[PDB]
Design a protein around this ligand. Sequence first.
Ligand SMILES: CCCc1sc(-c2ccc(OC)c(OCC(C)(C)O)c2)nc1CSc1nc(N)cc(N)n1
Ligand SMILES: CCCc1sc(-c2ccc(OC)c(OCC(C)(C)O)c2)nc1CSc1nc(N)cc(N)n1
Ligand SMILES: O=c1ccn([C@@H]2O[C@H](COP(=O)(O)OP(=O)(O)O)[C@@H](O)[C@H]2O)c(=O)[nH]1
Ligand SMILES: O=c1ccn([C@@H]2O[C@H](COP(=O)(O)OP(=O)(O)O)[C@@H](O)[C@H]2O)c(=O)[nH]1
Lengths: 231, 230
Amino acid sequence: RIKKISIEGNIAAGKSTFVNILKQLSEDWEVVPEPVARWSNLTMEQKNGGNVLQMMYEKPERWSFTFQTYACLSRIRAQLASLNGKLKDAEKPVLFFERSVYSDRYIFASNLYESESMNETEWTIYQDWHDWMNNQFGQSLELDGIIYLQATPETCLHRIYLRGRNEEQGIPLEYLEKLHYKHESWLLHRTLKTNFDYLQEVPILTLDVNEDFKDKYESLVEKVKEFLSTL
Amino acid sequence: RIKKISIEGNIAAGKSTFVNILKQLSEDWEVVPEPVARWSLTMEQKNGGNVLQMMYEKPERWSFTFQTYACLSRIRAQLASLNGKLKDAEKPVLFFERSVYSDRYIFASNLYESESMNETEWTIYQDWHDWMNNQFGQSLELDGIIYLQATPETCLHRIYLRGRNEEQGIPLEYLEKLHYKHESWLLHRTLKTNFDYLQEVPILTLDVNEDFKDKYESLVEKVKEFLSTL
Ligand SMILES: CCCc1sc(-c2ccc(OC)c(OCC(C)(C)O)c2)nc1CSc1nc(N)cc(N)n1
Ligand SMILES: CCCc1sc(-c2ccc(OC)c(OCC(C)(C)O)c2)nc1CSc1nc(N)cc(N)n1
Ligand SMILES: O=c1ccn([C@@H]2O[C@H](COP(=O)(O)OP(=O)(O)O)[C@@H](O)[C@H]2O)c(=O)[nH]1
Ligand SMILES: O=c1ccn([C@@H]2O[C@H](COP(=O)(O)OP(=O)(O)O)[C@@H](O)[C@H]2O)c(=O)[nH]1
């Protein structure tokens, strides 16, 4: 009954920008922000997240496992909070997830493994914790489609600056570049393996956000509604 | 309708010996051994083996990782046992070697108070513990608690008797912090926990300093008396 769609793409692709647009265009469309971003902006999770995000910045090799488990936990909790708690009588409800437990694992957590910020026991413990965390409480979270917002590392870095997050200025081009390749590989080229069978068959839509869209977004929105009707 | 009874106590106090003894006595009696005991070649066992050793070498690096995985591996070992064992019993009893409350209020609380987890790691751990252990409604929730009470020197002896290489380092000192906390939780029933029904969980304390492998009958008579009131 509630169709669930994941918005995916690089740091500063413009995911929050696109969802802040989309949610206003129908009373039947709602959105779940990624908790990591709310942490980059105050309850105890707000409290915990600021600290662990600031720690993760300072010493990623120490804090990656802890940050990753806590970002995923927070995301799973919140996707439930919106999902059992919003869009109650809507006629054609769609909830749009700002990223997903799949980008937590097969993009960001995996990349932290590959750049040696987690060891094989951390990675493997995380993979077990993920599998299980999502199986136990995460089942109503199966994805109906994904929208990949594809954008260059260069735009992304430029967009980081336009946001002005002082904590974020030091994030370098080559980091944006490897995530770009983790995304291109999973959602465009489709090399990336996963332990979730249905991620093979789930519909993906790819959108170029290279050009600004803040005052020019109608074609983007048409590709969405069109895509939704295939589901 | 399966009864859930946790067996609480200090390191090498006699939990695993006792639990094996109860399993032998009734066809309605089964055990859930504690995950970390078994780490002490499944995918859980490799990780478990590794993180335990990393904990023994540098606790203030690995305490958070350790506590998280220890509790997860427990929740899933317990969840599974409800889901196979004891379908065919009239008087079914599931004895757990330690509990989730054990994990958090004996061990995790101790590591943080002893500065091996910082504040963030401790509030993140507790957040997660609180969120998940409260998704399960009434499922792993205990019918009662059985506390095998020894002294630290008792526990030290038995650690030497038991003879695993890496425990041979455990200083009497640690066992002492681990004892005080079992008392505030179970005996004086001081501890304020986040789990309501647990304040209405009845407790059986057994004095277990006397070697009891040959003379457990008196202890087991009490367990029976307790299970019948329960
Ligand atoms: C964009 C703010 C979150 C951060 S901070 C960060 C980071 C920060 C500092 C770093 O070194 C100085 C760093 O280096 C990582 C690496 C060099 C690949 O080891 C990554 N990566 C990330 C992305 S990891 C991640 N995982 C999630 N599951 C969700 C999410 N939003 N982000
Ligand atoms: C018996 C094997 C588990 C270990 S290993 C360990 C440990 C090992 C070496 C240590 O010093 C280098 C150590 O120091 C702790 C301290 C002195 C308070 O920093 C603790 N504590 C423990 C007990 S923590 C724990 N948490 C659980 N959740 C369950 C359980 N059985 N034990
Ligand atoms: O068409 C656009 C798309 C994005 N942005 C800016 O680019 C940055 C990155 O976007 P956002 O924070 O939404 O990115 P996300 O990381 O959420 O994908 C922000 O400063 C946006 O205001 C913009 O000015 N015009
Ligand atoms: O009354 C007892 C109970 C235990 N043991 C021995 O002491 C060690 C520690 O016991 P156990 O493994 O049950 O302790 P736990 O860690 O489970 O509390 C084992 O080698 C037992 O054989 C003993 O000699 N007398």
